[PDB]
């Protein structure tokens, strides 16, 4: 009769189960890692390194818009009804070259370009023309890009998500990189084109093995914004079982700022003056004492949250990373090995 | 001057308060005392759908009431058979993070969306015997929170970029854009006639829209936190909402003001999903505390609980027939209630 319909509807259900089990042996054998953090944290450079060892193209698109924004400003200076007055008595071909890039068939983008505007950026007339060039349909991201010109000038510059927000080259809401360490398989998800309000889409990553929190130590108030974000992540009811691998990234810059000059962390963090380098501190060879104190004071600011709130369900793995570090993959691999073992030992009630 | 513009704004908004307060003469709970309560409403788990690896985020019932699609964060769309529990379709997605799914009223396509900012439409019945991706609607600069089908070529989506959108599936372009929400749009419910539809966002407000013109006809307030779910009353003249303030409210499009509040002091968790009975007499809501309450929509009393889930109840819904109630949860399991 129509019991034949069951034969296909049982055979079809079956020819799905044998692949759903094949999909289970691959899903459970791969660790999922969320790569959170602010844009200038170096998270993007860490990702580039991870892919190369084991989104970047947007740099050219940042460069072209910056060139258009700067050249636009030089033409604007003239367009002003009182054509603005330039503080530099002579352009020296700086402004002239900028003009010479007009409707370039495509811009090679050699360094002289930047050097030319790097100096013209603070020009009294240039700033005044840009302020007027507001009326001359001034670009929204021009001021921001003009401020970052030194950061962009570096050949090894790789744009932050704050930079890719200012430009419009982000279309894909999430970026993936699958890497394998010691034959183990890891899936890292760099959240792309999403708004700054995370209280809804952060609940999707409640089952990842670890959230990688990349932080900029040299930015000490960005650093306080990274501490309130960590605190809300650590205290969320849905992320209460998710471990957090903490990456205090910009170690080289933290060291220069602290050793070279006095930007007092004491200004923006008062209790640093009453802080002593810990006894379990392991300063590396040649590591100056204050920086070896600056590293652990910023590290203990996050550990204060994870201890005051952590009830024994989620753990925190701080690392004094640097974005170029080749060991970052291994650091993540060893922390995921520790997370899985602590989960098994809690099932047996051995911990 | 922003100050003058934001001052005429209170001059304009305060008058709406008195227009609704003047219309208030007798509470709905005050006019329903000549009728009897419905008593305790017990329901049982008839089926239990298994096969999803990760948590279940969304489920849309079929008008046929024979199939239903489920979206799970492990990158899988699964269409079930609520009578035989057999897996009809298994769709391997190219982006595991999905947050919604829809049952097209024609059964030829299914919808889904999530963190990839791309609404994917899959052709269930192509004339060679393989499901594959029919169309990818690109736009919306944010997560897709809810998508509902209009026909085989029109679909309304809601996103985390605080907007809604109408699409064209053949070309790929976006037809309409609904702007006005200041927070992430969470849920949407099409009206019976599909002339209107309501949307609840993270701004603690419900907005009544017009798919035809594109302007916000009405804006409903009274909730205290993000509205996570919204559904139309069957007669089309009302709608209920579920917020993070542990409260459900029954508004009314005609009177433009709230009519009933469904809350309990023992209830302190946010509502994740809402649905009405086929007669609209029972308001069913999914909660964060793993339970599902059965409210008397006419007397604001409680009349039953659907307590069979181990993790957070993410989705809810009644069949077009009006008997089965499906519940998804973060425990990877679906349940049919009756």
């Amino acid at each position, epitope marked *: 009769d129509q019991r034949n319909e069951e034969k296909a509807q049982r055979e079809a259900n079956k020819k799905i189960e044998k692949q759903l089990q094949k999909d289970k042996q691959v899903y459970r054998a791969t660790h999922r890692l969320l790569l959170l953090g602010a844009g200038e944290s170096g998270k993007n450079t860490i990702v580039k390194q991870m892919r190369i060892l084991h989104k970047a193209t947007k740099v050219q698109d940042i460069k072209n818009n910056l060139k258009e924004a700067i050249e636009t400003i030089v033409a604007a200076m003239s367009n002003l009804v009182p054509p603005v007055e330039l503080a530099n008595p002579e352009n020296q071909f700086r402004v002239d070259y900028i003009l010479s890039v007009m409707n370039v068939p495509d811009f090679d983008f050699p360094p002289e370009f930047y050097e030319h505007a790097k100096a013209l950026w603070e020009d009294e007339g240039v700033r005044a023309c840009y302020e007027r060039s507001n009326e001359y349909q001034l670009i929204d991201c021009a001021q921001y890009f003009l401020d970052k010109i030194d950061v962009i000038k570096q050949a090894d510059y790789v744009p932050s998500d704050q930079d890719l927000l200012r430009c419009r080259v982000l279309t894909s809401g999430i970026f993936e990189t699958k890497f394998q360490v010691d034959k183990v398989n890891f899936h890292m998800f760099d959240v792309g084109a999403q*708004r*700054d*309000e*995370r*209280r809804k889409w*952060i609940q999707c990553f409640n089952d990842v093995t670890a959230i990688i929190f990349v932080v900029a130590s040299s930015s000490y*108030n960005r650093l*306080q*914004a990274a501490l*309130k974000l960590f*605190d*809300s*992540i650590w*205290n*969320n*009811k849905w992320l209460r079982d998710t471990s957090v691998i903490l990456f205090l990234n910009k170690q080289d810059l933290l060291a220069e700022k602290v050793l070279a000059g006095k930007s007092k962390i004491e*200004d*923006y*963090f*008062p209790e640093f003056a009453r802080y002593t380098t810990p006894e379990d501190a392991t300063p590396e060879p040649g590591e100056d004492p204050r920086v070896t104190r600056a590293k652990y004071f910023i590290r203990d600011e996050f550990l204060r949250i994870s201890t005051a*709130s952590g009830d024994g369900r989620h753990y925190c793995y701080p690392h004094f990373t640097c974005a170029v570090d080749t060991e970052n993959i291994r650091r993540v691999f060893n922390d995921c090995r520790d997370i899985i073992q602590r989960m098994h030992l809690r099932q047996y009630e051995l911990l | 001057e922003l100050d003058q513009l*934001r001052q005429e704004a209170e001059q304009l908004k305060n008058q709406i308060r008195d227009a609704r307060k003047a219309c208030a003469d007798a509470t709905l709970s005050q006019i329903t005392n000549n009728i009897d309560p419905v008593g305790r409403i017990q329901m049982r788990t008839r089926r239990t759908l298994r096969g999803h690896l990760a948590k279940i985020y969304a489920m849309h019932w079929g008008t046929d009431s024979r199939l239903l699609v489920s979206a799970s964060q492990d990158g899988k769309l699964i269409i079930w058979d609520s009578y035989t529990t057999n897996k009809v379709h298994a769709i391997p997605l190219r982006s595991s993070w999905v947050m919604t799914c829809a049952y097209a009223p024609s059964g030829n396509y299914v919808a889904c969306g999530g963190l990839d900012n791309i609404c994917s439409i899959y052709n269930l019945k192509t004339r060679e015997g393989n499901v594959r991706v029919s169309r990818e609607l690109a736009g919306h600069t944010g997560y897709l929170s809810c998508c509902r089908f209009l026909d085989d070529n029109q679909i309304v989506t809601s996103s985390g970029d*605080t907007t809604c959108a109408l699409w064209d599936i053949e070309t790929g372009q976006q037809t309409t854009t609904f702007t006005g929400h*200041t*927070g992430d749009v969470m849920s949407l419910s099409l009206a019976p006639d599909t002339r209107l539809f309501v949307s609840g966002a*993270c*701004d*603690a*407000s419900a907005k009544l829209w017009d798919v035809r013109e594109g302007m916000c006809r009405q804006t409903f*307030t*009274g909730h*205290e*936190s*993000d509205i996570n779910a919204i559904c139309f009353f069957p007669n089309g003249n009302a709608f209920a909402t579920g917020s*993070d*303030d*542990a409260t459900c409210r029954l508004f009314d499009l005609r009177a433009d003001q709230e009519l009933m509040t469904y809350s309990h002091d023992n209830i*302190i968790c*946010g509502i994740t999903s809402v649905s009405f009975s086929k007669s609209g007499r029972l308001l069913l809501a999914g909660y964060d505390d793993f339970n599902c309450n059965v409210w008397d929509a006419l007397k604001a009393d409680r009349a039953g609980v659907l307590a069979g889930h181990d993790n957070r109840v993410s989705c809810l819904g009644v069949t077009d027939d009006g008997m089965a109630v499906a519940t998804g949860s973060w425990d990877s399991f679906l349940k049919i209630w009756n």
Partner: nanobody
Amino acid sequence: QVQLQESGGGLVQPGGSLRLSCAASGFTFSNYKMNWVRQAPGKGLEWVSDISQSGASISYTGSVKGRFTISRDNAKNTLYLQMNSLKPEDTAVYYCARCPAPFTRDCFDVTSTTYAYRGQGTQVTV
């Protein structure tokens, strides 16, 4: 509906004091955590302080401790920010922000560019 109205502020001399008030309506004040946020001219939003539902837990940023003090009267739905020893660096629009969900331990997006449960603010110039 959820409405937060901030009062007080204006131009003041350095080393002075200021009393900022935030009148709430449209929600149960005793169920939510409160915050104070500011936006310096030419800079993003920065979290200033926060107080719990009852007040038994208070926090401040690393540049206002000892000077600012935040209090709330749950019986009258009011949030205060008593400011003292003001510097020309604390000049900004000060917003009264509410935590998204009630009975919650975290507040995720109180300093985002677009956040609903936040007043129009009051300008404080030093």
